[PDB]
Design a protein around this ligand. Structure first.
Ligand SMILES: CC1=C(CCOP(=O)(O)OP(=O)(O)O)SCN1Cc1cnc(C)nc1N
Ligand SMILES: CC1=C(CCOP(=O)(O)OP(=O)(O)O)SCN1Cc1cnc(C)nc1N
Ligand SMILES: [Ca+2]
Ligand SMILES: [Ca+2]
Lengths: 675, 675
């Protein structure tokens, strides 16, 4: 039949791509081609409009199987061709060895690191439910799309998927339909060696619906029926167990050897003949398969055409909501939204930056509907919920509504990170955030790195940033955390010192379209600074205190800026004139012009950095560094700062030593380099 | 009764400690005091010998509840007193706000970061099973101890605990007995808001045994009976559901407000009177409670006395095993074990450092019985299994034996990290390791940081360290990873360049007693270097190529050392004389004498670093840095190195620019500083 020919075409495109690269993963593509065929035939999508907001989404969580995804995209006429498949895993191609949303048309997210994609799917589905609750009206199903996820044994072993699956079950996300490739094989061999749990019983315990397909190597009728069944269960996410043979059809089917290396050439020949293909030919695309797939595309395009007319009618019936929706689909924030950001003067009271963050959110959430967010069981500590909003919960619970704006993630940092990526991936201008203690953002590093690689504008509200948190002690106090994320490409790590800097940090985070943000916020109160403004802090680094005859410049962040200003006064009494630079975001600063940056960190003067955590990175901006390169302590925070000499006198002593160390030396800006 | 008085004493010590600090967590201590009393009465331990190898272990995974643990330790006469309880959460005390094994007698591990302790308990139990299988003989139950873990809702939400619980069920770890504090309250309020899964059904799906105690606020008989029941189930770990009221007895019991802040003074008064204590008194310890607890200690000490005689008899009956066991309990490796480390010369073939690691393990595993380890589903890629060893599995599976030495962790990096911490915590000189790709060590950051804080000599075998892995692409290629871990206190991050350096890295990792190791290893082959040796590489950094008239020194690690040596030859043709320094471990180097370090990185010469990942940290050792501060690419590895100019000519160009940049300047070692 044409369906059988399409499945063979998919299988053989994937095998031939792996063969051409002499690299990659043929096993899961062979096993999942029937399911991929069946799912894509049920999906609504436009290969010529990858951003249609009511498309069904597909996520390949087992991203090593991407030769399968690329084959589907090619067959459906996305902006990906057989010539790109021939360049699988080759430098600069559109077919990298794991799918990247920035590079691959039709890849919703970046997968490959196991467990991430299913959590991203939870976030896409969460966003769709929130979006539909916000915009749909009687006779106007603006959003009614599904989220389809493929995942394997490896994703099911990774704890992040347990976190997200528990939460998705709690949230009753009935438009999520996941498919487990139940092939009993991973890299170390049989799953009997390490993965003998009853997966289905576990997913029932989360509140998921289950459909089992015992012959998923052939039974596309049953796979399609499983999708229909899942769509009728509107209050539970569904897991479809696809019992497959890894490498189905290969001489080596059902073995770990077919997981992750090219097939032998003789194996590929027998595959082709068993399925009616020419064993002398590679990258075959039978025209009848193209015709069949084209008919589905044409039907989907007529569905999108009708959706566009529905949207036009919605704009007439619901003028305000329609304009809001249009603005969001255009990727634009409300005009002048930033006028809602709080502004402070030096006469205002000292405030912790976690509380300043609460105040910002309180002002901007009512003005910017595409902001949603939550906390990992730290709502009253991170201060991430605006008073008067409702939680995102299924209404059946009585605890919230899908129109709600605040997510109770539970103690699930890693899944929160990957769910945020999925919310961003949904689109519609979502600007979403997640709170935890800064030290526990590290639990989510797998997802945070993917925010950066995927270019998603997510935001971590990362409070309790340092030894300033006090008594909880060294298990809670960041040392390495800023250095880790600042060393990751494409992460904006804001450590605001005061009210105006906190507003600048949020301006950056909400305006972002391609860069994730981490806002490192204090438990403890900090004064409003003389010289701060949103305007200057928006530059990432700026001269807070200018001193034309400076003997030294002190560059600092966050809680240490006020410390530097107090040290300047001690130094004055020692006959030393200091300037102060505040560096709330190193990435934003780095992006400024060379001339601007040199105006902040000029030649001809020693520069000392001060920040109560690792000194890594700081030599970009300073000649000497005063930091904290050991673990913290459990005690009242001011006593810890005193112990480690983060006091005005301790900073002054090190500044004076810095001045003395450079006497008789020629000093050029840390910004200079040889290449 | 005395038991009732003991429970009240525990509760009130914990409340009074929180009150004195005006900080900390009274709720879970109040709820778990009955269970703590019951469990400690079943445990075998010696407060005067915290290292008795056959003690039962206790782990408080919900580490915020540590006022409970400290109260138990005080009441049982560990080296912790009421005066220490009065200093709870005060700078420098023995009672920090979360328990630290380095500081608190009777704290087996460092907990507080949720989810870790239960996984540590899995590792303690895994080690006990391996240890017992190795040493026990008929009539000689050298090891027969249990592992008791308390955990709360937060630990159950964290994915790492799912990973470890799935694995522990697979491993049939019948001496593990965990207790869930089922109090339905977390920081964000009721668990109904985020955590509605059927926990018991999930644990059954992992293959755990379940006991439910529905009245754990009072029913110590049922808690004791649950322990007895768990001990009869020898092939399953057990979860005991303790249904408790958080803050039991408080006016605020059953609320989130009692989780994490001191009680009101009037509340503490009514607690004391309801339980027969003087509301005017704090830190009361009734002498009848001390007497009751002392009788249990005296009985336990007689048990240990008999164990010591059993061990003496074992040494006569099993002379070789007895001597091996004695050596391990003395904390000593076999005499001259390091003579088994492979040594190479420059005439030997090029080898990937992952393969060199395999060869080391092959030589040292047969010589050092206390080495065990595994991989997170990457055994044939990390090359972490020695041929001829058997896997650690329950014999009932047919797949291994508890005497085995190789652990199939599955795709569970985070739990592997925390399990390794538990294996190290067991003691008996275990030197244990875990393999994954370097980029996915990041999934385990929560546990890795705790290895450093806890001072455990665990080892990550972290292969596929860079863009050198090639086609899997940027989702797999480390950039920030070394910088992250090098910025963490107390992590030895070895990046060996060749065979001799790989042997030095293992010498360090296996000899370690207080410092975790990460070995960053290559996919790709590297040449044996002229000038390398175990002796010199053991210094962490050393002069590979000495050049008395150097115009520049190039400092490099790993795969980039050979690149530096090739660049030296290009530079010679440009009239520039270079030296080369290899820096296989920055931490070990930093610990050398100032004079040694200056002999490697002298004054008076520009120094350029080369390492194909982040430049963070490198200014400690260099004036200019050539690194990779952007994500990687999917292609054949040599093409990626060429794209980014990590070639002999690209290094030479940057070296020549460095020489030119310092012409006319006075240059001092990067090791110098102002303070
Ligand atoms: C173990 C591992 C794999 C086996 C998957 O096993 P699986 O899901 O059952 O896949 P399969 O049915 O055999 O094709 S892929 C490559 N990888 C390394 C790998 C490890 N950890 C993380 C976080 N991401 C990864 N990418
Ligand atoms: C959320 C959070 C807590 C609630 C526990 O909730 P729980 O286990 O149910 O404890 P309980 O019964 O209420 O006393 S503790 C402090 N913490 C922050 C916290 C967050 N993430 C990590 C990895 N470790 C932490 N330490
Ligand atoms: Ca599999
Ligand atoms: Ca709880």
């Amino acid at each position: 039949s044409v369906d059988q020919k399409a499945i063979s075409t998919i299988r053989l495109l994937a095998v031939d791509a792996v063969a051409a690269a002499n690299s990659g993963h043929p096993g899961a593509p062979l096993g999942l081609a029937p399911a991929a065929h069946a799912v894509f035939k049920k999906m609504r999508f436009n290969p010529k409009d990858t951003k249609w907001i009511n498309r069904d989404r597909f996520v390949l969580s087992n991203g090593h199987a991407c030769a399968l995804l690329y084959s589907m995209l090619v067959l459906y006429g996305y902006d990906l061709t057989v010539e790109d498949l021939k360049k699988f895993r080759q430098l600069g191609s559109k077919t990298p060895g794991h799918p990247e949303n920035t590079d691959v048309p039709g890849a919703e997210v970046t997968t490959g690191p196991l467990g991430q994609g299913i959590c991203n799917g939870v976030g896409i589905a969460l966003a769709q439910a929130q979006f539909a609750a916000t915009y749909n009206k009687p006779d106007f199903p603006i959003s009614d799309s599904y989220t389809y996820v493929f995942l394997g044994d490896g994703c099911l072993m990774e704890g992040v998927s347990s976190e997200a699956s528990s939460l998705a079950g709690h949230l009753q996300l009935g438009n999520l339909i996941a498919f487990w490739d139940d092939n009993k094989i991973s890299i170390d061999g049989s799953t009997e060696v390490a993965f003998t749990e009853d997966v289905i019983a576990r997913y029932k315990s989360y509140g998921w619906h289950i459909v089992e397909v015992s012959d998923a190597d052939t039974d596309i009728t049953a796979i399609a029926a499983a999708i229909d069944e899942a769509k009728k269960v509107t209050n539970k996410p569904t897991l479809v167990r696809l019992t497959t043979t890894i490498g189905f059809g290969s001489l080596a089917q059902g073995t770990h050897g077919v997981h992750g290396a090219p097939l032998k050439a003789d194996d590929i020949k027998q595959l082709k003949t068993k399925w009616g293909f020419n064993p002398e030919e590679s990258f075959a695309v039978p025209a009848e398969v193209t015709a069949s797939y084209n008919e589905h595309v044409a039907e989907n395009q007529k569905i999108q055409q009708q959706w566009n007319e529905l949207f036009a009618a919605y704009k007439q019936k619901y003028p305000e909501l329609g304009a809001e929706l249009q603005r969001r689909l255009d990727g634009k924030l409300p005009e002048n939204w930033d006028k809602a950001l709080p502004v402070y003067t030096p006469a205002d009271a000292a405030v912790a930056t976690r509380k300043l963050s609460e105040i910002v959110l309180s002002k901007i959430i009512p003005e910017v509907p595409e902001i949603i967010g939550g906390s990992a069981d730290l709502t009253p500590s991170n201060l991430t919920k605006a008073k008067g909003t409702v939680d995102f919960q299924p209404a059946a619970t009585g605890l919230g509504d899908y129109s709600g704006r605040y997510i109770r993630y539970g103690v699930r940092e890693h899944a929160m990170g990957a769910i945020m990526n999925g919310i961003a991936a949904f689109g519609a201008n979502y600007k979403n955030y997640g709170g935890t203690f800064l030290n526990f953002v590290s639990y989510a590093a797998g997802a945070v790195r993917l925010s950066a690689l995927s270019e998603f504008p997510i935001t971590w509200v990362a409070t309790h940033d340092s030894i300033g948190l006090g008594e909880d002690g060294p298990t809670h106090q960041p040392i390495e955390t800023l250095a880790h994320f600042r060393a990751t490409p494409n992460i904006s790590v804001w450590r605001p010192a005061d009210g105006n800097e906190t507003s600048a940090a949020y301006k950056s985070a909400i305006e972002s379209t391609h860069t994730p943000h981490i806002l490192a916020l204090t438990r403890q109160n900090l004064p409003q600074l003389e010289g701060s403004s949103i305007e200057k802090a928006s530059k990432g680094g700026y001269t807070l205190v200018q001193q034309d005859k400076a003997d030294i410049i002190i560059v600092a962040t966050g809680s240490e800026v006020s410390l530097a200003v107090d040290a300047l006064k001690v130094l004055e009494g020692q006959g030393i004139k200091a300037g102060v630079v505040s560096l709330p975001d190193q990435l934003t600063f780095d992006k400024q012009s060379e001339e601007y940056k040199l105006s902040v960190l000029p030649d001809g003067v020693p520069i000392l950095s001060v920040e109560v955590m690792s000194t890594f990175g700081w030599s970009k901006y300073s000649h000497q560094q005063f930091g904290l390169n050991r673990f913290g302590a459990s005690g009242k925070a001011p006593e810890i700062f005193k112990l480690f000499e983060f006091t005005p006198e301790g900073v002054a002593e090190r500044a004076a030593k810095t001045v003395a160390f450079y006497k008789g030396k020629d000093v050029v800006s840390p910004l200079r380099s040889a290449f």
